[PDB]
């Protein structure tokens, strides 16, 4: 019941300033990748069994402890067995035959890959095992990928230096007028895995983040790989295998992501943006535990926050996937941590955590003190940053044009460095007049116009609005 944060009036008065007391240490320790976790694990604990939920009845899927089992930080992944059958989900709505009938001209992002043996990844000459995973981009239609997927299967039915294969990825199932029956089928899921829910942080973004708060579909042939990654901004993820074939999952706990980052660097690969497939022998030598399991048709895979993982098709199948963000301190903490790390790495945060945090403060009554403090700390830092910049512009006599923002207007990012740009947008005079609105962050704008002569400053939010949202965000009763 104790407020530990200053009021918006106090933050503003603090910004109106050499001799006065501080309100907070604006300096913050910079993000870095963690060392190998303590305590270290012996060899006999490096192949742990996968946390599993065995569903039989529709009632089983709505059992409240399921959500807590999945979000438990000690469980890096949970496989929910029999989920589609328990809910009488019609997986046929996502079959390739149904997709071709529904939208045969829909776009498919093809990844062209080498068919690699089992859990291994070899150089293209088949000489040695390497971490780099060849996966080159092209685009086709559902109709044409479907023909390939079907012909691949017929060819193998004939009983039979790596084969080239094609993985159909990132098929956009967001348009409810093209995918009405498919999307309605997913409303049968329990709330904690649904694409849209009041308890899903990504449902509070206020705009589409494609493939995170909308569904994407994947069409596969054996060997189709999603290489090593953490989810965007460490958000939990949901994956259902449509079948008819199986998928194989490889999972490492979040706490080892620094070790994996180091493995990538040692192999001349970028952890966040590169294409890499771990060598299991390297991980075993370094005492990194690996969860490894098969996802059958109708099985749902829950990837917990920040879990490091990589996946391959064993047979022919489709999968559907999206992300969710539990309303938890752990989820928010890891999303903010990766947001900060992404800035230092100049990697775009697909989830605009500042925009989202302010929407969370508008919409959500937070009753957990630890989560509440994290969100309000973020509001404090960004409110102070905005008012500081605003005063600096006013002090230099730089006009601030009221721009406002429309319904569901997305967060904007810097066209140069790809940082989120919140509230105060820097746009060149030319881009403003032509309404291209190429946003720059402050730092990137100044690098080409130290006094901002070539730029206008557009203001999205009234400062009074932000101050009121901040003051009205208080700890909710349990
Ligand atoms: C579609 N997808 C998305 C992810 O984030 C994965 O980790 C794995 C897949 C897959 O089914 O290969
Ligand atoms: Mn994933
Ligand atoms: Zn920038």
DSSP category for residue 199: T
Q: Give 14's contacts (C-beta < 8 A, 6+ positions apart).
A: 6, 20, 22, 23, 384
Per 3-state DSSP, what percentage of the chain is helix, strand, and coil (rounded to 5)? Answer: 35, 20, 40
Instruction: Give 259: exposed, middle or buried? Use CB within 10 Å, 0-12, 13-18, 19+.
Output: buried
Calculate ∠ Cα 194-199-201, nearest 5°: 90
Contact call for residues 327 and 199 (beta carbons, < 8 A)? yes
Alpha helices by DSSP H, listed for 242-285, are: 257-266, 280-285
**Resolution value (Å, 1 decimal):** 1.6
321 within ligand 1 shell (Cβ under 6 A): yes
Residues with their C more than 2.5 Å from the N of the next written residue in the chain, i.e. before a break, are 17, 160
Edge to edge, the sheet with strand 439-440 lists 400-402, 455-459, 424-428, 439-440
In the chain, CATH 1.20.58.1370 sits at 1-16+329-395+463-478
DSSP category for residue 129: B
Residue 102 half-sphere exposure toward CB, CA atoms < 13 A:
20
CA 396 from centroid of its chain's CA atoms: 39
Q: Which two tokens stand for residue 400?
A: 């601030």
359 within ligand 1 shell (Cβ under 6 A): no
Angle between helices 329-345 and 369-395 (to 10 degrees): 40
Return the CATH fold of 17-328: Jelly Rolls (2.60.120)
263 within ligand 1 shell (Cβ under 6 A): no
d(CA 261, ligand 1 centre) in Å:
19
Going by alpha carbons, the residue nearest to atom 3 of ligand 1 is 321
Q: Give 390's contacts (C-beta < 8 A, 6+ positions apart).
A: 400, 424, 463
The span from the CA of 451 to the CA of 408, in Å, is 32
3-class secondary-structure state, position 34:
coil
Contact call for residues 254 and 334 (beta carbons, < 8 A)? yes
- Other CB atoms closer than 10 Å to residue 338's CB: what's the count? 26
DSSP category for residue 370: H
Residue ranges of the annotated binding site for Fe cation are 229, 231, 309
E-strand stretches of 192-286: 216-220, 225-229, 236-244, 247-252
E-strand stretches of 325-472: 400-402, 412-413, 420-421, 424-428, 439-440, 455-459
The span from the CA of 106 to the CA of 103, in Å, is 6
CATH number of 1-16+329-395+463-478: 1.20.58.1370
d(CA 460, ligand 1 centre) in Å:
36
Pairing of strands 424-428, 439-440: antiparallel
Q: Which two tokens stand for residue 49?
A: 């069994």
Q: Ligand nearest 169 Cα, by number?
A: 1
- Select from 427, 373, 421 the least CA-distant residue to 401: 427
In the chain, CATH 2.60.120.650 sits at 17-328
Please confirm whether the linkage preceding 127 is cis (ω < 30° from 0).
no
Query: What does each C-alpha distance from 10 to 361, 379, 380, 471 come to in angstroms?
Result: 19, 14, 11, 11
Query: What does each C-alpha distance from 22 to 11, 12, 13 come to in angstroms?
Result: 10, 12, 11
3-class secondary-structure state, position 55:
coil
In the chain, CATH 2.10.110.20 sits at 396-462
- Tokens 């006065």 belong to residue: 20
Pairing of strands 400-402, 455-459: parallel
Name the residue of 171, 211, 226, 313 to mutate for ligand 1: max ligand atoms within 8 A of Cβ: 226
- The residues that bridge with 113 in the sheet, in sequence order, are 135, 165
DSSP category for residue 18: -
- Tokens 């093209």 belong to residue: 178
3-class secondary-structure state, position 244:
strand
DSSP category for residue 404: -
- Tokens 């630890």 belong to residue: 370
The span from the CA of 354 to the CA of 201, in Å, is 13
Its CATH architecture, for the domain 396-462, is Ribbon (2.10)
């Amino acid at each position: 019941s104790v407020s530990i944060y200053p009021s918006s009036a106090e933050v503003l008065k603090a910004c109106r300033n050499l001799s006065n007391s501080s309100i907070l240490l604006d300096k913050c320790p910079p993000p870095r990748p963690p060392s190998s976790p303590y305590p270290p694990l012996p060899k006999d604990k490096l192949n742990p069994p996968t946390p599993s939920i065995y569903l039989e009845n529709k009632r089983d899927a709505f059992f409240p402890p399921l959500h807590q089992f999945c979000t438990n930080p000690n469980n890096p992944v949970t496989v929910i067995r029999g989920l589609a059958g328990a809910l009488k989900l019609d997986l046929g709505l996502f079959s390739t035959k149904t997709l071709v009938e529904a939208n045969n001209e829909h776009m498919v992002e093809v990844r062209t890959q080498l068919l690699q043996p089992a859990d291994e990844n070899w150089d293209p000459t088949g000489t040695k095992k390497i971490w780099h995973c060849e996966s080159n981009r092209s685009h086709t239609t559902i109709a044409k990928y479907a023909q390939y997927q079907a012909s691949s299967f017929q060819e193998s039915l004939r009983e039979e230096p790596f084969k080239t294969i094609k993985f159909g990825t990132n098929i956009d199932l967001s348009d409810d007028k093209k995918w009405k029956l498919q999307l309605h089928e997913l409303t049968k899921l329990p709330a904690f895995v649904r694409v849209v829910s009041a308890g899903n942080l990504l449902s509070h973004v206020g705009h589409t983040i494609l493939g995170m708060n909308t569904v994407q579909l994947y069409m596969k042939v054996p060997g189709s790989r999603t290489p090593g990654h953490q989810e965007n901004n460490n958000f939990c993820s949901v994956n259902i295998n449509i079948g008819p074939g199986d998928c194989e999952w490889f999972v490492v706990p979040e706490g080892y992501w620094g070790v994996l980052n180091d493995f990538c660097e040692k192999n001349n690969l970028n952890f966040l943006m590169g294409s890499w497939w771990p060598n299991l022998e390297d991980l075993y030598e370094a005492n990194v535990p690996v969860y490894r399991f098969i996802q059958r048709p109708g099985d749902l895979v829950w990837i917990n926050a920040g879990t490091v993982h990589w996946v391959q098709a064993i047979g022919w199948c489709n999968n559907i996937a999206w992300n969710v963000g539990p309303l938890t301190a752990c989820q928010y903490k890891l999303a903010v941590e990766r947001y900060e790390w992404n800035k230092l790495q100049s990697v775009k945060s697909i989830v605009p955590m500042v925009h989202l945090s302010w929407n969370m403060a508008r919409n959500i009554k937070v009753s957990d003190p630890k989560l509440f403090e994290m969100i309000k700390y973020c509001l404090l830092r960004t409110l102070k940053q905005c008012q500081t910049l605003r005063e600096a512009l006013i002090a230099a006599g730089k006009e601030i044009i009221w721009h406002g923002r429309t319904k569901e207007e997305p967060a904007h990012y810097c066209s140069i460095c790809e940082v989120e740009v919140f509230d105060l947008l820097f746009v060149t005079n030319e881009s403003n007049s032509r309404k291209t609105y190429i946003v720059h962050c402050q730092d990137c704008a100044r690098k080409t116009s130290g006094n901002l002569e070539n730029f206008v400053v557009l203001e999205q939010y009234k400062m009074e609005d932000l101050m009121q949202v901040y003051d009205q965000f208080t700890l909710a009763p349990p």
